[PDB]
Amino acid sequence: AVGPVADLTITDAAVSPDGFSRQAVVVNGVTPGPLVAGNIGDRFQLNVIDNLTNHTMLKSTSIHWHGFFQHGTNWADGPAFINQCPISPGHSFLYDFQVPDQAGTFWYHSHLSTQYCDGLRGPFVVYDPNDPHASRYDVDNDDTVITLADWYHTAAKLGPRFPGGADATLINGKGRAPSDSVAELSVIKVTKGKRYRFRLVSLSCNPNHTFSIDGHNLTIIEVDSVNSQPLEVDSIQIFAAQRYSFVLDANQAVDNYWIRANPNFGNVGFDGGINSAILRYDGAPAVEPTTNQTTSVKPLNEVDLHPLVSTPVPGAPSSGGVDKAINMAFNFNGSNFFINGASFVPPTVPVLLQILSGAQTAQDLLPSGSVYVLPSNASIEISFPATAAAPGAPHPFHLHGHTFAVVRSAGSTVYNYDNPIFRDVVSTGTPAAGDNVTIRFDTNNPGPWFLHCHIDFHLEGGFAVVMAEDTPDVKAVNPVPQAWSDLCPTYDALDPNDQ
Ligand SMILES: *[C@@H]1O[C@H](CO)[C@@H](O[C@@H]2O[C@H](CO)[C@@H](O[C@@H]3O[C@H](CO[C@H]4O[C@H](CO[C@H]5O[C@H](CO)[C@@H](O)[C@H](O)[C@@H]5O)[C@@H](O)[C@H](O[C@H]5O[C@H](CO)[C@@H](O)[C@H](O)[C@@H]5O)[C@@H]4O)[C@@H](O)[C@H](O[C@H]4O[C@H](CO)[C@@H](O)[C@H](O)[C@@H]4O)[C@@H]3O)[C@H](O)[C@H]2NC(C)=O)[C@H](O)[C@H]1NC(C)=O
Ligand SMILES: *[C@@H]1O[C@H](CO)[C@@H](O[C@@H]2O[C@H](CO)[C@@H](O[C@@H]3O[C@H](CO)[C@@H](O)[C@H](O)[C@@H]3O)[C@H](O)[C@H]2NC(C)=O)[C@H](O)[C@H]1NC(C)=O
Ligand SMILES: *[C@@H]1O[C@H](CO)[C@@H](O[C@@H]2O[C@H](CO)[C@@H](O)[C@H](O)[C@H]2NC(C)=O)[C@H](O)[C@H]1NC(C)=O
Ligand SMILES: *[C@@H]1O[C@H](CO)[C@@H](O)[C@H](O)[C@H]1NC(C)=O
Ligand SMILES: [Cu+2]
Ligand SMILES: [Cu+2]
Ligand SMILES: [Cu+2]
């Protein structure tokens, strides 16, 4: 791992994760990028050095540290034109923030256009030396991170606006496409008798994946950086940008077992060892598994997840029993997505810079119609009713700056105001099920925070709004470093072909 104080150098390079060589955006030479790690209480100083040269995958960049509250450091959150202007090619920018009150599995990715899909994404772990789940496992290290990623042979800006699936699913950076039946598979090593904390992180730009390991059950202990009660499952449907920790007990026969991550669309299944990796017990021959998948009898259901510790739901236990309730009405016209009638177009002046320049009301903030000003220290309920008007369901929405209670999950009609899981990315389900996924959070984090579908192609199409939380306190609470102040002039001075 690298960090908490580290350089992350961003370049364009040729990669071949599935045997097909293409130019990609890489971090310290690799995609997925290296594991960034630290411990709860740490200050991270992550110096992002932009050495990009290819305008088609963008020469500018900006990085979101997915899942972190960024309290007092809203300027470091990452979304381009929300929290900063992009970093310009030939420049570096220091993200300097603390993680005082969180531990778990996170990730980092470009938050400029669809650039993360072209490779700028990697895992990020914040360890807890007093982890309350520590007694459940023996091993938790670099080699227990499992990343899932969709990989495309055609670059984000060069393919269809809304691709119909990836060429390959990558597990720990490797996987197979139809074009190369023998490409190297990732191998995850375990020692018989040891218990492993696997940190499963979806770096996906679009598809969700149904994850399972032949011959093994999994005990979920963490959901999007929130410790859970232990939940035994035999498969996990993980949506773009979500994380789970699960414990695997390596107590089966020494052998090779298939690890499966089946996407919801694209090249589905396992012909030729696509959508697969290898769980290899020490002493097993260096060959492919020949294990068979068994029907999932205990799939994960989000309504079965509960916080490990008592975690009260904001507000009162009825619909709209909060200080402010917002409904998000979705539309789509073939190229663009809309929320409450507005398709998000990034403003010239980043939203945070607008606020620091005086703009504190929805009326004064740009883009008009996409900013929701929230009161401070208030309970908020947001509902995302699934609608056929917004194809590409299930849309996994992410709220920056916050964890939220999932009061109503996809595929459920229960409102749980008692002990629902808290997380940061939620499937909003499907219209076929009449879903109306509903979340609650408190506004104790002054700043503009993005709220959007984490299918990066949909975000690009405008499927986003901004929650402008406690605007009159944003400047005092989020002092900005000179380097941040310099971003917009530098970026704005760029030739368009150097963006
Ligand atoms: C800036 O970034 C953008 C975005 O990433 C990038 O865009 C690329 O732009 C080019 C030019 O438009 C696109 O080029 C197409 O690439 C197609 C795919 O090429 C892959 O496969 C080639 C064929 O492989 C077979 O053969 C070899 C044996 O020769 C074998 O090993 C293979 O297994 C397989 O059997 C392969 O040659 C090629 O590898 C070259 O390129 C990669 C980088 O792409 C490089 O890393 C390698 O070292 C090597 O130089 C690659 O693996 C290709 O099929 C396609 O060609 C057909 O179409 C053209 C035009 O329509 C026809 O005229 C031609 O005859 C072919 O029929 C064309 O070349 C490419 O797709 C874009 N990339 C992406 C990801 O979208 C820019 O290039 C970047 N800028 C810079 C300066 O790098
Ligand atoms: C993973 O979890 C599943 C679900 O809890 C476990 O499945 C259960 O496994 C036992 C066998 O270990 C099954 O019972 C056995 O069934 C056979 C055949 O009918 C019978 O001959 C035995 O006497 C015994 O009763 C049980 O049906 C099955 N339960 C299910 C599928 O709901 C599984 O064992 C766990 N895997 C591991 C590796 O721990
Ligand atoms: C999804 O849930 C929301 C939140 O409860 C529903 O919106 C409320 O609808 C009632 C009428 O039933 C209005 O009186 C409220 O003002 C709405 N709340 C808002 C806008 O915050 C919504 O109708 C539900 N949608 C579906 C499709 O079930
Ligand atoms: C969809 O709406 C957008 C944004 O308002 C508009 O620019 C675009 O032309 C429309 N697309 C289609 C396919 O009609
Ligand atoms: Cu993210
Ligand atoms: Cu979406
Ligand atoms: Cu975001």
Question: Could you tell me if 305 and 315 lie in one domain?
Answer: no
Six token digits for residue 334: 């073939």
Give the span between the Cα atoms of 41 and 58, in whole angstroms. 34
Q: Is residue 234 within 6 Å of ligand 2 at its C-beta?
A: yes
What is the C-alpha end-to-end distance of the chain, expressed in Å? Answer: 30
Q: What is the residue whose two structure tokens read 């960034």?
A: 36
Q: Retrieve residue 150's tokens.
A: 């969709």
Q: What is the dihedral of CA 241, 246, 251, 256, to 10 degrees?
A: 0
What is the C-alpha to C-alpha distance for residues 83 and 468, in angstroms, rounded to an integer? 11
Q: How many Å lie between the centroid of ligand 1 and the Cα of residue 111?
A: 26
CATH number of domain containing 2: 2.60.40.420
Structure token digits, residue 309? 């510790």
Beta bridge partner(s), residue 288:
none
Look-up of token digits 């740490």: 42
252 lies in the same domain as 297: yes
Q: How far is CA 173 from CA 18, 187, 241, 433, in A?
A: 9, 11, 16, 34
Pocket probe for ligand 2: among 218, 298, 300, the residue whose CB has the most ligand atoms within 8 Å is 298
Q: Pull the structure tokens for residue 498.
A: 């150097």
- What residues are paired with 384 via a beta bridge? 437
> With contact defined as beta carbons under 8 Å apart, do 365 and 357 qualify?
no
- Single-letter amino acid, residue 23: Q
- Whether residues 120 and 159 share a domain: the answer is no
For residue 391, report the distance from its CA to the centre of ligand 6, in Å: 8
SS3 for the chain, per residue? Answer: CECCEEEEEEEEEEECCCCCCEEEEEECCECCCCCEEEECCCEEEEEEEECCCCHHHCCCECEEEECCCCCCCHHHCCCECCCECCECCCCEEEEEEECCCCCEEEEEEECCCCHHHHCCEEEEEEECCCCCCHHHCCECCHHHEEEEEEECCCCCCCCCCCCCCCCEEEECCECCCCCCCCCCCCEEEECCCCEEEEEEEECCCCCCEEEEECCECEEEEEECCEEEEEEEECEEEECCCCEEEEEEECCCCCCEEEEEEEECCCCCCCHHHCCEEEEEECCCCCCCCCCCCCCCCCECCHHHCCECCCCCCCCCCCCCCCCEEEECCEEECCCCEEECCECCCCCCCCHHHHHHCCCCCCCCCCCCCCEEEECCCCEEEEEEECCCCCCCCCCEEEECCCCEEEEECCCCCCCCCCCCCEECEEECCCHHHCCEEEEEEECCCCEEEEEEECCHHHHHCCCEEEEEECHHHHHHHCCCCHHHHHHHHHHHCCCHHHC
Residues with CB under 6 A from ligand 4: 333-336, 343
The sign of the dihedral angle between the CA atoms of 456, 458, 462, 463 is negative
The number of CA neighbours under 13 Å toward the Cβ of 22 is: 20
Q: How many domains does the chain have?
A: 3
Identity of residue 494 = L
Residue 78 CA to residue 426 CA, distance in Å, equals: 20
432 Cα–ligand 4 center, Å: 26
114 and 5 share one domain: yes
Q: Which of 309, 325, 358 is the last residue of a domain?
A: 309
Q: Sign of the CA dihedral 399, 239, 34, 194? A: positive
Nearest to 250 by CA among 209, 283, 297: 283
- Looking at the CA of 344, name the nearest ligand: 4
Spatial CA neighbour of 354 closest among 75, 88, 114, 94: 75
User: By alpha-carbon position, which residue is closest to atom 3 of ligand 3?
Assistant: 383
CA 276 from chain centre, in angstroms, equals 21
Residues 270 and 153 in one domain: yes
4: preceding bond cis by omega (within 30 degrees) = yes
Whether the CB of 413 sits within 6 Å of ligand 1 = no
Q: Is 454 marked as a binding-site residue?
A: yes
Which token pair is 378?
Answer: 């208030």
Name residues whose C-beta falls within 8 Å of residue 417's C-beta, 6 or more positions apart in sequence.
313, 315, 316, 317, 318, 321, 407
Q: Is the peptide bond before 367 cis (omega within 30 degrees of 0)?
A: yes
Same domain? 232 vs 377: no
Does residue 82 sit in the same domain as residue 209? Answer: no
- Do residues 192 and 76 both lie within one domain? no
| Domain boundary, last residue among 255, 284, 309 | 309
The finding on whether 217 has its CB within 6 A of some atom of ligand 2 is: yes
Q: Any idea which residue has 């030396």 for tokens? A: 129
- Return d(Cα 130, Cα 134) in angstroms, integer: 7
Domain boundary among 132, 158, 183: 132
Whether residue 315 is found in the same domain as residue 301: no
Sign of CA dihedral 453, 31, 41, 46: negative
CA trace torsion 417, 422, 424, 428 (10° rounding)? -40
Is 109 annotated to bind a ligand? Reply is yes
128/167 same-domain check? no
- Note the ligand closest to the C-alpha atom of 367: 4
Ligand 3 contacts CB of residue 342 (under 6 A): no
- Does the beta carbon of 54 sit less than 6 angstroms from any atom of ligand 1? yes
Domain co-membership, 274 together with 329: no
Q: How far apart are CA 66 and CA 402, in angstroms?
A: 10
Q: Which atom of ligand 2 is nearest to the CA of 251?
A: 38
Ligand 2 within 6 A of CB of 327: no
Give distance in angstroms: CA of 499 to centre of ligand 4: 24
**Which of these, 175, 376, 139, lies nearest to 262 by C-alpha position?**
175
Evaluate whether 78 touches 135 at the Cβ level (below 8 Å): no
Mutate to test the pocket of ligand 2, among 192, 195, 217 (most ligand atoms within 8 A of CB): 217
Resolution of the determined structure in angstroms stands at: 1.2
CA atoms within 13 A on the CB side of 402: 29
The token pair that represents 363 in the structure block: 């009326």
The answer to whether 361 touches 383, Cβ cutoff 8 Å, is no
Q: Is the CB of 22 under 6 A from ligand 1?
A: yes
* Residue 66 among known ligand-binding residues: yes
Is 289 found in the same domain as 150? yes
Kindly list the catalytic residues.
64, 66, 109, 111, 395, 398, 400, 452-455, 458, 463
Domain encompassing residue 200: 133-309
Judge whether 428 and 412 are in contact, CB under 8 Å: no
Torsion over CA of 284, 289, 294 and 299, rounded to 10 degrees?
80
